[PDB]
Amino acid sequence: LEGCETAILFPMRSKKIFGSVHPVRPMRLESFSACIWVKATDVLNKTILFSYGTKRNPYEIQLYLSYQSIVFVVGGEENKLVAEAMVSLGRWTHLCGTWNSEEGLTSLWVNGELAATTVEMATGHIVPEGGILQIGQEKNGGFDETLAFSGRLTGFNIWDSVLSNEEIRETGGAESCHIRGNIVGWGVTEIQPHGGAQYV
Template sequence: MDITKWDKLFSMLENSQMRENMLLQFVAQYGGACGVAVETAGRRMSMQMEARLRESMEHLRQDQSTAAGKSAGNSGNSHQETLLQQLITAVRTQASRLIKLENSCLSNPGPVTPPEAKGGNLQQDVASAEMLDALVTELAKTRAVLEIALKSARQRHLPAGCETALLFPMRSRRIFSSVTPDLPLSLSSFTVCLWAKPVSISNRTVLFSYGTKRNPYEIQLILSGTRALFTVGGEAHLVEGRGVVRGGIWTHICGAWSSEQGIASLWADGHRVAFTPGVAEGHVLPNGGSLQLGQEKNGGGVSGGSGGSGSEMPGFEGGFDAKLAFIGKITGVNMWDRVLTEEEISQLALQDGEGCEQRGNVIGWGLTEIVPHGGAQFIN
């Protein structure tokens, strides 16, 4: 289900609250002298709200029925449908209370009421105010239900319009994904970006790694606790961003580097979180190394070809360390042979955007060959 549908629901509920405030002002100004038009508007509002919510839930059911991996998502779908049913119940409750309030207004004779009836009118005004307070409270509860459903939907669905992701189910030296770039990696500048949703982060967890037998650490994009780290040409200079990653949450991470002045920068969710000059200044990445996701090759194995397809499985196993393995999901992996602008990176990092459609010319998600090994697999 598109996240924009949830935004429409929020807008609809905010409009409902605004109309309730208008009704409250009307009661205060005219002492309850409501007309048939107010009742009609209230009924129409409640009917429109319920109809739109039913339509949204039907779209959700259709999306879920056509999605892959039905068995894995059954429990999540049931939970989301329950939340929407609760939302519809809450809207019906609001509609009922609005009707009662409007009937109360209609039964009030307004400013022509004789003085002896003022006591009864005052009681009606108090009751009307209490009803409005209850409506506001109910609306707040409904909004809370929507926020929970929205958060749940965002975490179950892939970000940035991505249709697939790589799943790394456990920490193992046999579980990784090898990447064959579309261009040689003899680069003097680049930007690499990806979405990551870690389940567990150790002191050193590898997201993206490129290296040769001579230097296994040509490019490193790694996690450590809540930190993200990026380096080029070795680990003499680590570009570090603190407090940018959390377990169970999708985070967009980019590392950019230029050989000129050795400018390296690290980005998290579209914001530059670290910037360091003098990183591998004048260096050119060597071609012919191995590029992998979810692991790093420590030099003990056999080097792959120009992209490191990883066909020499025994050599790869010998060069991997289970302690460094990534656990979780990765999607939207892209690499360019240039430094992207701030605007370009910000657009890629929009969770509700279409960043997955902006593919790199060195690595393009969905176009470049990526081969899962061990228990790693593509999921929808």
């Protein structure tokens, strides 16, 4: 089935390495879940996994890796949920971020386990459509190479609703392949790798 035996490789860090995601449905989100499999080659202070932003706000949605933590941003750089758990370099890891504008509920999951959570994070904010959605780097470039991802990514998915631990664990299970998002679906949604990035 679609997007099953494929990943995207970022060989090195550079000023033009990134990947563009082109969903058919609009990116207007009152609540969402965004998952991705990451195998990091090297991590710096801010290594982007995926990032969504408009011209007025480049940090509408972001998931990145830090030296000792994993950071999930929704609706502005002031809104950071930090999971002090650290990804192992070279090791496939399923990361999900979930968020709901309703009470600012924000959760960060590592391999189907809740690694962090908080409330009142961008409460009442609606993520706007028409922005730029990238993997491995943030928008405008060329780019800042110290932010670029190095390694492998796959199974990038976005649902317009907060999944449950059942559904999240399943997305991180042996059938990760066939579980896709309705906004961004790995294997059907068009993802173009640029600047040296490319499928494997």
